[PDB]
């Protein structure tokens, strides 16, 4: 059989494994789409005997399972009550009981190291308290700040974030922080004395982007600022002995292009070290895919002896595991042409459980030898699909751009192509721009290959995966060399793979990739069909309408509207609409507030004004993340409009 | 004793009079707001003994009453069924019965001359027929430029059908095909020919001529009377049926073109423009916030056929004129007022006029056409007009920077005493091809009642002053129009001692919002500004507004792919760095005439630059909120405007 | 502190224990009322380490838990889906999953001995199939005698089907046809045979024998094991599968027939009634208002197959005995208490008993089968029992008018110090073939708490005292049963000095409401009376009660077309002219056991004759209101009873 659009309904994404404290079993999450085309996620257990069994079952989403320090309770988050709350499932028998009842639910939580309580993140309006509980003429809205809406949740009310202690038995709640403008990552020390959390303590929170690590003495209730504006940080992790705190962070020297590095602080000594300051590699997961997108990645994990940290890193299309010792060495431990998107490390052994995806493998758990870098399959969560349907592999190649710069790309061949045949080529361009295509499972790409298209996808400069200079190169040069890198790849793929039909080329891409799709068709006539998605066409309006417009444009394109309007206009695809003579399908969602739908309307109207071939498809109620986590029926429709457009105009 | 915002809930708009065919009585409409803050409208009869009595009563809207040619039935439109439908009320006893049950309701109707049927306008999806009746996830695929309207939101592209409805049986029969768009329609006195305006262009959204089609009722054959020579509305057959009159123009000046009176003689295949040499716009261009949806009369032939009575807009007035076929034109109901409704007696030189003025909300008057003397027939705002003191609007003229004469009006706070001065608020109307004038304006009374002197003017671009004056703004946005307004502030300061020249505010909506934004970016004399349903960025406007694909070109001068720097130069956002006046930005979420992104861009740039500004966003409201939107929201908009000036001007 | 009406909301009823197969732990059920005054019930686990742990938690009812043969799964019934369905809970980790989705739910289930399937009982209309799933005018034509039930109103004639449900897939398969009725059922330990009790009579409503049918699970072939010899319940196969135990009788005394232990040997075609010569009623006849719907044990085989553990009702006690296949019957668990749930260890001489007594609501106990000594395992009412003073029930005996010995019990109000006297309330139990005794009774505590001495006795007609005593009421309603109760009142006054002989009240429900009505028409000794869900007219009862078409004949002695005057002579309404006791009449609108027309006739006749009476009608409740009905209505009913005695007794 061959991949169909409806196969996205069968996909199952295992993610987020965590060991029991005895290291003999692990809990993890399986996200699926059910018969009613709704998302569900449930907890599963990998057991010592190798059995993999489901432990939660309802028409809801369970997430973020963590074993208590004793191992007797699996804490987790679930939306089964109508909001996301913290529930408690016994590890040895019995159903889960609901622990928290916040009106606004729970975003995140940690266990206390003594297991008597958990620390949960909730949010409160100024008129609300932690005692307010979930309860499952007209007024204008007054806006007075720059950051007043988000793609994730629309109009904001400015609720403040609160970390609360929740007693494991009684459920009694007690605020630990004040009402914070924003709380990010948080973590309590192994001795239970200190709560570290990332906060926005700036006087103008919307326009200043440093983020401070704040330490809270639980007993004394006193807070000390560990960073005092030296950067921004995430994924905090205390060392086993409690004397060091690790964080992923950076100093914003290249704004959103800045490489994320491993920091280690010594709170008692007041000092910090950037362990990977001399390793030109971006820590974390920049990988672009449409499966596992919401999966909880692992931050840095200390080695049990406190000698260093296992970190994932994004290089050359791979997300792999490395060990950064405090003494200096940086060594690979789990390497290969794949996407490591979930990780649990054994409490004592040189062993790990890793969730790994590749172009021909949706995603599964593997036991990994930390010392020898080999793995053994634990799960086969997509067995029928992988046993029935042929997957196209993604073959990497490199090419030189117009200035000699080496670029990396990948090609997939239609698995129905017999020798001597040529397929039309679809170029996929990834968003960000500081993201990374690579060795992960991509249903859209499979669908295109199965529909008879060769698929090219590349990492033009501006991508992550190739170090600080490469990811930064696109800033201020939107539509310059980034655009040459992609067109060099088209030419390079044509010359390197004879199964490509040079006369039948298409291009598609979303967000930045949508900006670049629009840019392309206004600058070359080489393509017979183009599909732009969640795209940008006018940087001037983008700044004032996008939920991040008021800093993104400046950060990426180079300036604000009142600084250099004509530069913004010159880098706007709409400027080149007179040149556009390629049928252009414009896909956009009504509630996409990252790229406002006015971006799509402007381009569609100018093309229609000029008598050009174009069509605008508006997806209701969806946002920018539609293609990854939006309504599954609309994901099907989006894929069908893409494929039908190339079918009409490439075939 | 002085106007308040909540007084808008008290306002009653009497409108749309129509004589019974014997001339002895007349039916009209009264629109109001009930204690649930909801719009109702009901039918009323003026009965010659002088009595005015209510004839419909429920929690619904009755509209457009018309007596049958025999006078025994009053037809009207009502939404009481849940959609607007044609009902019939006996003229001498009994309640109304529903006549039409169309799934998509009725937009408009006319009586047949014999009274046995009525012609109704409905709309049908491609999958629908005239037989479908009213009855109580997939992406949207958009393939055309005109895919949404401020009035309806997203359009489904139903086509228009005119259907004959038998008066006794309600049986329906389609007369037209499924038209892309049907405007005015009228049936000839002999009942044989239906004339209607249609969009017969191959690219309907980008071509703005509209054709008069003549449809032989018996054969259904059609002839195109106009073949693209302009655009037309308000059809009216002569009494002998040999001539067809219409209001129209040839688009020579796009949206600024004067509307003129045309007469067609279908049998001779000739046409003539009867007001070609009269430099006055026919129709009603008046700006107000009361009587906004009141149906205007349309041209009325003299019984003998020697000419037509037409309303027309000039110098702040909407008056009634007689245009003789030979050329001469007389005012026949004139005065410093707004004639917003009209019926002419069947056999006499008498009329019923709905008339508003700055100190009179609006009432019906019996008018002798021989001399223009009036008798009041209604007093629909008696309580409010007896308790609340109204500020008059005093007209004046002044010269602009280049000498051109401009007309304006000043309002002084009624509670102001001899020596005292009040801060001035300048109001700027939208359009721009509209006309401030002598009409009741609740919002202007509220500003006066709040202790503000109120200046409002007709800068060039306004209607009311001839073809050159109304066209002058096109291609010169923020040029001489801005000068006219500033010259008005200066002249007002000079001429009127009660103005406190040290406290000036400015506010306006739509084009008036573009202009408020323009003003605070080009001068700092105002200590406060409120911009409403405004424009800040012409480049995004063209692509997002429901009419942006022609308005920017028609009015600013070009499309973004022709001259983007010219659009930018006239965009108020370009000048945001100069902006030092506290700017309250009012905008509605579902305004698609001026999309909310215009306000959002200006808000963000001002906040980025640390300037004083707030963004107030009205849910579910569209561009017409201040006139016909949710009354509670209308209250809130008025409060937000007055509060901003109170904060920064007092 | 002492008992209040609202304490019924705090009561928790532990019930229905079952051992895991390794005997180290037992699952049970706890029924409670939550803060919404709704009933909940959840699974709990007791383990041999002493821990008592709650295993389900949601806003619903879980019940009937049973470990699978290997003990890795706990099957149980839950209504959380909106219908009662079979759910599976992992025995050692993980949440429950729903196994069945019948549109009509599941009434009962058993495990396959090999653990791979379960057999569930569902019901189906004639147009339904087992494939129909839960999905969360017309005149009604009635053609049979049993056309409605107190439990479920008008019956739709759904037929019962036993279906095999695969554990893994949930794939279902009908095993039986559509049965007129299915009662007990059991799968033999080798998996080859399903035993179930069916109504196989040609006229099902009027013939009351019930057959044990044997069904070969492979072939679905069926055999009738009993062929009309009686009626049967509580089937249990011997460990080696050669014998089938049942609780049954041959109806020789109709509803008064003692229930006995039968043991069949299907292959030999033989049977023994092993308690035929033991004049004791097997099962639980106890009267109480707590634990009402708790699942009793049924007969349990000794692991070696040598005999059966049976509960029995005797002299106010529900106690445990052992019946050897070799003949002897010996006590096992004995005392002045109510054994209302029981599980016996799968291999050792130990049991888990749920035990109630007048001063203990109900808890679980480890019991030694060797000597009967017990250790407390739960304390589910600890706060309540720590805080409120319980009044004990002191038993006594007395002789009736003909010398027959009767057993009764008295309760002294806790707040009553030595020397002081209290008015007496006589409670009369229903049935009549039931048994007052040593069980917790919230209503009786509340009466004691409210300052009333409480007398409750077992007149002839009661169970607990042999075949002759329980049979004695039939054909003698209001005769010696009434004498027994009156003699109990005299005896209590004579023996218990704290009774104020001048202030006597009486109350009772169903049969005891008939008796209350009888009493007040035959004696004026009582100053207050409260009759509940009662009977006043045996003639109409026959035709309107859900069981009237046989109860009256069976109990009162004849049908209305046999001897109407006998029915009238025994109808309390016949004596209404004699009634001089203020009578509160309590009845529910949807009681179809005792229809509300019974209450209305007595009310009307008393009012016609000017007597003191009030009628209180409970909406939406049925006959079982006082035990399992709407908690708020249960409080209202207790409230009205106490208020009536407070008004006339104190
Ligand atoms: Na997989
Ligand atoms: Na209607
Ligand atoms: Na004038
Ligand atoms: Na344009
Ligand atoms: Na300014
Ligand atoms: Na108890
Ligand atoms: Na009874
Ligand atoms: Na008898
Ligand atoms: Na009842």
UniProtKB/TrEMBL annotation, chains B, C:
Q: Which GO terms describe its biological process?
A: proteolysis
Listed A to Z, the keywords are: Hydrolase, Protease, Serine protease
Q: Does the keyword Nucleotidyltransferase apply?
A: no
Domain of life, per UniProt, equals Bacteria
Write out the transmembrane intervals: none
Family annotation (Gene3D superfamilies)? alpha/beta hydrolase, TolB, C-terminal domain
Please state every residue range assigned to the domain named Peptidase S9 prolyl oligopeptidase catalytic.
439-650
What are the GO MF terms of this UniProt record? Answer: serine-type endopeptidase activity
Signal peptide extent: none
Keyword Mitochondrion applies:
no
Q: Which family does it belong to?
A: Belongs to the peptidase S9C family.
Q: What is this protein called?
A: Acylamino-acid-releasing enzyme
Q: Which organism is it from?
A: Geobacillus stearothermophilus
């Amino acid at each position: 059989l061959y991949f169909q659009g409806t196969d996205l309904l069968r996909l199952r994404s295992v993610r987020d494994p965590h060991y029991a404290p005895d290291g003999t079993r692990a809990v993890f999450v399986e996200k699926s789409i059910d018969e009613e085309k709704q998302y569900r996620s449930h907890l599963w257990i990998w057991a010592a005997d190798g059995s993999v069994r489901q432990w939660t079952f309802g028409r809801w989403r369970d997430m973020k399972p963590r074993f208590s320090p004793r191992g007797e309770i699996i804490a987790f988050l679930s939306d089964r009550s109508g909001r996301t709350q913290l529930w408690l499932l016994p590890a040895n028998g019995g159903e889960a009981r609901q622990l928290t009842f916040f009106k606004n639910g729970v975003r995140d939580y940690v266990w206390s190291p003594d297991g008597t309580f958990l620390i949960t993140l909730t949010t409160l309006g100024d008129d609300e308290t932690i005692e307010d509980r979930e309860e499952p003429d007209l007024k204008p809205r007054v806006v007075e700040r720059l950051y007043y809406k988000s793609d994730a949740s629309g109009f904001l009310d400015g609720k403040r974030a609160v970390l609360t202690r929740i007693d494991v038995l009684s459920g009694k709640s007690e605020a630990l922080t004040g009402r914070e403008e924003e709380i990010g990552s948080f973590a309590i020390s192994p001795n239970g004395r200190t709560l570290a959390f990332v906060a926005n303590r700036n006087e103008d929170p919307d326009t200043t982007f440093t983020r401070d690590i704040v330490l809270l003495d639980l007993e004394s209730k006193a807070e000390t600022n560990l960073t005092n504006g030296c950067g921004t940080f995430a994924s905090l992790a205390w060392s086993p002995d409690g004397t060091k705190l690790a964080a992923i962070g950076h100093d914003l020297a290249y704004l959103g292009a800045t490489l994320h590095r491993l920091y280690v602080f010594e709170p008692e000594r007041g000092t910090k070290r950037v362990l990977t300051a001399d390793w030109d590699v971006h820590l974390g997961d920049a990988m672009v895919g449409d499966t596992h997108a919401d999966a909880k990645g692992p931050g840095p994990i200390w080695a049990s002896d406190g000698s260093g940290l296992y970190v994932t890193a994004s290089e050359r299309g791979r997300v792999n595991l490395y060990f950064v010792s405090l003494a200096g060495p940086i060594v690979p431990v789990i390497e290969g042409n794949f996407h490591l998107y979930g990780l649990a490390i054994h409490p004592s052994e040189q062993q790990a459980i890793a969730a790994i995806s590749s172009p021909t493998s949706v995603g599964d758990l593997y036991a990994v030898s930390l010392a020898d870098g080999t793995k053994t399959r634990l799960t086969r969560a997509n067995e029928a699909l992988e046993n029935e349907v042929v997957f196209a592999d993604a073959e990497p190649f490199t090419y030189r751009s117009a200035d000699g710069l080496e670029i990396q790309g990948w090609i997939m061949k239609p698995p129905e192509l017999d020798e001597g045949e040529k397929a039309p080529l679809v170029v996929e361009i990834h968003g960000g721009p500081h993201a990374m295509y690579g060795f992960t499972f991509f249903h859209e790409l499979q669908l295109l290959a199965s529909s008879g298209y060769a698929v090219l996808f590349t990492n033009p400069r501006g991508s992550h995966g190739y170090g600080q200079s490469f990811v930064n190169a696109v800033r201020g040069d939107y539509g310059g060399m980034d655009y040459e890198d992609i067109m060099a790849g088209v030419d390079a793929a044509i010359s390197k793979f004879d199964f490509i039909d040079k006369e039948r080329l298409g291009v598609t891409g979303g967000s930045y990739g949508g900006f670049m799709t629009n840019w392309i068709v206004g600058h070359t006539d080489r393509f017979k069909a183009a599909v732009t998605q969640r795209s940008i066409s006018n940087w001037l309006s983008f700044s004032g309408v996008s939920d991040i417009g008021y800093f993104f444009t400046k950060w990426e394109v180079g300036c604000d509207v009142w600084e250099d309007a004509e530069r913004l206009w010159h880098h706007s695809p709409l400027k080149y609409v007179k040149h556009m003579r390629t049928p252009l399908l414009i896909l956009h969602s009504e509630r996409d507030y990252r790229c406002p739908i006015e971006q799509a309307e402007q381009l569609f109207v100018a093309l229609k004004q000029l008598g050009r071939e174009t069509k605008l498809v508006r997806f209701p109620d969806a946002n920018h993340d539609l293609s990854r986590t939006g309504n599954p029926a609309l994901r099907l429709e989006r894929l069908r409009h893409i494929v039908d457009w190339f079918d009409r105009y490439l075939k």
